[PDB]
UniProtKB/Swiss-Prot annotation, chains C, D:
Matching CDD domains: NAD_bind_1_Glu_DH
Protein name: Glutamate dehydrogenase
Species of the source: Thermococcus profundus
Gene: gdhA
UniProt keyword annotations, A-Z: NAD, NADP, Oxidoreductase
UniProt family annotation: Belongs to the Glu/Leu/Phe/Val dehydrogenases family.
Entry-linked SMART domains: ELFV_dehydrog (SM00839)
Length: 416, 416, 415, 415
């Protein structure tokens, strides 16, 4: 259905830039395994309600499938299939020994007590136990799941598995007490910062004293603005959320803006700044624009008005295929979403490695390994885009799909 | 999802005639587990093609899920979900320690060589291995599958399972050499004959010298006609295939008609018979009319023209909900499909028992146990229809859904 | 103390057979004992940890078999004693089982339905690694019933992922999920077959003879009902804890059960005379069936018993002092773990139906129970005649002999 | 009573931190307790059944870790206490483990080598269903050693059918079959790192400063030798059960060990003068290391201690009355389960090497032991400063806090 058909189209469009057999392309267009389950819980009032849960394993040629669990009332199988498909490319572009998976439950978690949320987390694991495992499929947090829910899920898994293996390794995003990793909270923003540092090096830009704008001020947007200021020495001139943006050409302090948003609900009306719309933030003259909120914010309509030299796609799919052509015609370097935001899954890979090896790393070890991986992935994608004269997004597919295809050939799944 | 929405509607309709909590009804309306998988084969020419496979486990309150695998180019998930739902009622009406399941592959088996069919059978088992087993979910043949395919599937399961358990028990409809049961080929017809015998007793009819017409001349219709003549002493005045019917007031021999159909391609122009339409066959004045071809042949359009005293639903769903009311108002006794045709799953239950117990029964043992089960199930449904003054089909739902609901209550899945 | 008593009775009966000292020392120690935390969240949100136990005393003959008690006074010593007795009871009826038992230290009267379900599931999660249809198969006991067994079977099947016959993990289940016909009456119906065979061994026709029954719980009611309906007896007395009733002409067990439901006691039953439990025990009857409590026939009153057959339906109703006295007086006792073995025998039939995926008629269960209890009776009786020993000691000879022989045939003990 | 004492130290710990009642009650109860028959055939042909224990106190933080004790006085109460204590010891050095302990009631001096192997293999067979490299990982303890760990690993692998990293089922293995470098000196070497960090906390440079060590077994010898060789200390006194020796210009630990091997005691070492154990405890030194027996520093002698640092290498050498007195004197104690955590830390390293199929150098084991003991010392020390409490209470706070957090993060306790 529609998110899934867009994911398949993005794959069909990039496949024109590589030699891939029709048999391999057809395999890559179909998730290998899809599970739809009844997830029953007892409510606080004693009534039993059955929720709909999904787990999708797109492709495990390179290793166990990896990806998060979304709890959302709008949740469809189409969306979970799309995002499992994207996870296959994301883990492959950063060269992880994984495949792509994704899960979800059709629920409004704001209507569930803590007790009901725990009963749902546990019931989900009991419904999908036979297709998950530390060497099979490793979930993680996503929309309206978090380390608290991951702790309950791990606990339930370990109970059913009878402590026979590295049960901590069944799921990532765990609390530190029970096999979590250092660097989880900043992983997505921190990896995007490394990709932005490398894009600047490729363009011959010193980011010290240059300007960034960040669309969105959830965890990812906040940490993107904080880390760009603290690590790259940038000036954060604009941030935004769903209620509007703020602008100050001499810089915002990201911690002070976050404090403001916690007191009043939005960055809007932050003292010393001008209120601006989301559209004006996207059109600002900055060295880096980081769309870190919602999909399809840069499209055919506004692509011509973007002035950023680097668009760091922190959110999933914030730039449409028609906008890709325009930004590239203007000489603007995009960091495609599944490269730019791959820090999240990379640190979750490090967590899993810590779990199956029974040995935990320091914050500095996690950070240097994340840096090497994101730096090497950026250079493979940029070098491919230069050598083949293609859009960065097509280069990202070429790097990723090549690895998945090669694994499928070396297993004999496809004969060519 | 139209076949599935119809099956849910039939449940909702029957639920008015019993005491069942909302929480239990909502649970019974949703299959507990749905799997969609890629089933890849290497074709004889060396290309790899990926087919879509399904396995649905509707409800396992009463025991392992039970139901066949249908290979058809029309196959949809909606159809597999509908038929898995029906299997839950079927196994419960004849009091088997099973729940309902079903599987399918979207394929045209006419276009596959023997070698390709064997690859597809083995690939299906590899794709659904983790959710099947002798105590979990036990498939069987269905449309365009058969004992040859069951043999390949059992063999692949035993290969993966490493002979640790009663691997013959993973699937029924097997060849006799490898754990098959006597009574397999005639089970659906033989069970239907027992229900017809009991329905005639309930109405005070002696079927000896009375007229039967059978619509359809597949295995089920041929054997319904053959056994009605040999065991009940009826005169078979009419049979049909997809092309047309034949009629002879002095009787047709079912073995002769089958030889004619093998020799000339259809029942048409059988010597001495009158050629008739399918509609004319449904309108004959007979004691027993057995629709054993397709679905929805008795509808609001023609229900008023049925003259039979007993309508034996051998096929799954030949009478629509509007026809049910007309036939009942005319005083016509229907033997509802999931009671009338439950002989097939009953003998597959006996095959599974013989496999898990390592001990094989005679022809006469299978036949006597089938007789007692079908006889008892018929009396429970008929007495429920009389005691509550409800349609035979609503009485079949009350007997079946009552047992599944009781299992769900006794496990604590639903509190009321 | 309850464990030390079980050991003493084994030491006692040991004198009546040659058993090596290495085999006797092995039989005196349960092979496995588990004690576990059983945590539940209460309806009010607080987490409480209960104490649970499972004991597998001996598995030489087969998987261990026995129930789970939920009682605020539960001790490990008690669970260990009853696991030991369980090994003898399954052996006396020739079942392919050994003995186990479990319990939780809880007052269930203080738990909601929701809290009880949480506790039943938490117990299975805590003992999962040592239970299974071929390992150790629990059952209902004190404050345990088919409802709780249903919840436990379900939790086990959820952890095991439906890989084997999970129905067979636990007996006393509801009929909807692998229960057996014959469960509700099994103890009474088994007792009745041993009473019928004891009457044959004494040359008595019980048709028109008298029976008294102490207790009008499930076991006492059905013993009275089936003695009347199947054996042809007149039921002259029955009692509960609040006293007894007597009528030399007959009581109708169904009318008394109805009376007892309306009033909460059998007392004042129309047409009959109130009597004490002690006067019930003393009646002149062909059969006395104590099925209420233990130690009701002691040194103190054994000389006042006049029944020709004492059918021990309850556990331990007759003391060892009383045994010598009743036997001196020529009274035939049906010892408890033979007389009441119907329960475990039908729980065996239930396990068989579950592992074979095939269910039996009420008539099939009755007929198999008859043959097993009849054969067990003649083995214990014929042993007591041939070796000239008390029926109780002949029951231990039959039982311990089978357990010992299985331990020798496995090489656990050399001699 | 050993167990009740362990419960009382947990209840004491709860006073220095916010911990829910439901969490405290959970931590007072071992989650799992197993008591098993461990039968062996003696060389003489006779079968004897021994009594074995395995206790898993808490596995919130990871699989349970701890030793097996073979001792004729062994009680379940002791094994429960030591398992409870083990939960805190793995948490203070931040290991991904819970606490367990096991034991057999046996006099090993009465068993031949062939009988000791039969016993080791019989134990693993009896506890197989509750142990494993991700479940519960034993180790040596009283009268068990690497030879017995070898037999026990081998029996586990034979039952498991080589499906997993079976080497990782048990630590203290011989080097040939997955043992670790650093095992023999782990306690002393970890104590040395804590003494180095204690000196840094106090602003003392230990080079040229004096240490006294009570005891001259493996732990006391290596504490003396590593203090001298790595910290640059002068070893002025050591002792054993027969008495102490003193030389203010320093003792060579190897010359004193050769004298003890020849004569039985450090006493009368020609290169020193004799002192009593009490005089050793009262010497003016930067470091005193009690490395022998429990309760040597008491209310009777604590005011006479002059040491700037008391490194508790042995378990329990200082009483709670003495804790208060040394603290009022400004003497810095390194509590036993922090100071001696080198043993369980190197046993964690062995398990890591087993599960990863990759073995470390002596230098790699030492550097990772250094980082772990250094980090643990600073947490305990920072807690004791930040909350103004005794080092021992701060160690309990760091440990219990970690276990509590894992239990909340799992949803075992809601608060
Ligand atoms: Na982030």
């Amino acid at each position: 259905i529609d998110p899934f058909e867009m994911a398949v189209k993005q794959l069909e469009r990039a496949a024109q830039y590589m030699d891939i057999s029709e048999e391999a392309l057809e395999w890559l267009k179909k998730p290998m395994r899809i599970v739809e389950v009844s997830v029953p819980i007892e409510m606080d009032d004693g009534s039993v309600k059955v929720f709909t849960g999904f787990r999708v394993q797109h492709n495990w040629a390179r290793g166990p499938t990896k990806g998060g669990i979304r709890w959302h009332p709008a949740e469809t199988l189409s969306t979970v299939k799309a995002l499992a498909t994207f996870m296959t490319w994301k883990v492959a572009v950063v060269d992880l020994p994984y495949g792509g998976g994704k899960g979800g439950i059709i629920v409004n978690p704001k209507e569930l007590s803590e007790r009901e949320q725990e009963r749902l987390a546990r019931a989900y694991i009991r419904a999908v136990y036979d297709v998950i495992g530390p060497w099979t499929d490793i979930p993680a947090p996503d929309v309206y799941t978090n380390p608290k829910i991951m702790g309950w899920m791990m606990d339930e898994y370990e109970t059913i598995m009878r402590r026979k293996g590295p049960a901590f390794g069944v799921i990532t995003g765990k609390p530190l007490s029970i096999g979590g990793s250092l660097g989880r909270g900043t992983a997505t923003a921190q990896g995007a910062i490394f990709t932005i540092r490398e894009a600047a090096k490729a363009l011959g830009i010193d980011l010290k004293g240059k300007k960034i704008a960040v669309q969105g001020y959830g965890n990812a947007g906040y940490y993107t603005a904080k880390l760009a200021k603290e690590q790259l020495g940038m000036t954060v001139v604009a941030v935004s959320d769903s209620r509007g943006g703020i602008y100050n050409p001499d810089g915002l302090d990201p911690d002070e803006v976050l404090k403001w948003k916690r007191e009043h609900g939005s960055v809007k009306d932050f003292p010393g700044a001008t209120n601006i719309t989301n559209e004006e933030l996207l059109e600002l003259e900055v060295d880096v624009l980081a769309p870190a909120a919602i999909e399809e914010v840069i499209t055919e309509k506004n692509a011509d008005n973007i002035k950023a030299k680097i668009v760091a796609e922190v959110a999933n799919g914030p730039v449409t295929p028609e906008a890709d052509d325009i930004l590239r015609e203007k000489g603007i370097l995009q960091i495609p979403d599944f490269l730019c935001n791959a820090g999240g899954v990379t640190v979750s890979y490090f967590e899993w490695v810590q779990n199956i090896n029974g040995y935990y790393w320091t914050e500095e070890e996690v950070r240097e390994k994340l840096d090497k991986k994101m730096t090497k992935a950026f250079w493979e994608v940029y070098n491919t885009h230069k050598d083949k004269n293609i859009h960065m997004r097509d280069a990202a597919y070429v790097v990723a799909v090549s690895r998945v295809y090669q694994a499928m050939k070396d297993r004999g799944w496809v004969k060519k």
